[PDB]
């Protein structure tokens, strides 16, 4: 089915070292990321976001009482070429929200969308990824 152009991410980080969680794609294994989702009809960012983050790390934010911090940035960028023809036709820009979550610590994650999982430093989860709006999230609400 098609992929909604309107999406969430998630930059997970651990508080006391401050490094960042990635993961590796599964339909692009070159492609290591935060946690992206697309908002679904009915449901609201924050909705989707603390639904991503439960899917993709099995970690509940509400059980557990951590704090999803919404950014307050939201963004537009062009659709990987390579990944497009899983939207609309016609569909080549994307919207996406962004979100920050604290965890107190590393710890270990079991992850259902990707193949593998790494704790970076801030800078080097930065430079990782291939996404633009993910590295400038890492930069802006990770690094300051
Ligand atoms: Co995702
Ligand atoms: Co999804
Ligand atoms: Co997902
Ligand atoms: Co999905």
Redo the contacts with the bound molecule.
């Keep these: 089915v098609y992929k909604r152009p309107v999406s969430i991410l998630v930059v997970i980080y651990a508080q006391d070292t401050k490094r960042v969680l990635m993961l590796q794609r599964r339909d692009d294994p070159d492609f290591w990321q935060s946690?992206?989702?697309?908002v679904e009809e009915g449901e609201t960012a924050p909705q989707a976001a603390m639904?991503?983050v439960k899917?993709?790390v099995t970690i509940d934010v509400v059980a557990e009482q951590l704090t999803l911090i919404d950014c307050q940035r939201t963004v537009e960028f062009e659709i990987f070429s390579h990944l497009r023809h899983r939207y609309a036709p016609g569909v080549t820009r994307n919207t996406e929200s962004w979100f920050c979550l604290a965890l107190p610590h590393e710890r270990q994650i079991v992850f259902?969308?990707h193949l593998a999982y790494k704790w970076l430093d801030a800078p080097a989860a930065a430079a990782l990824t291939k996404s633009w709006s993910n590295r400038q999230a890492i930069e802006q609400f990770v690094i300051n």
């Excluded at 946690?35 to 697309?38: A, Q």
């Design positions: 946690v992206t989702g697309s639904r991503e899917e993709e259902t969308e």
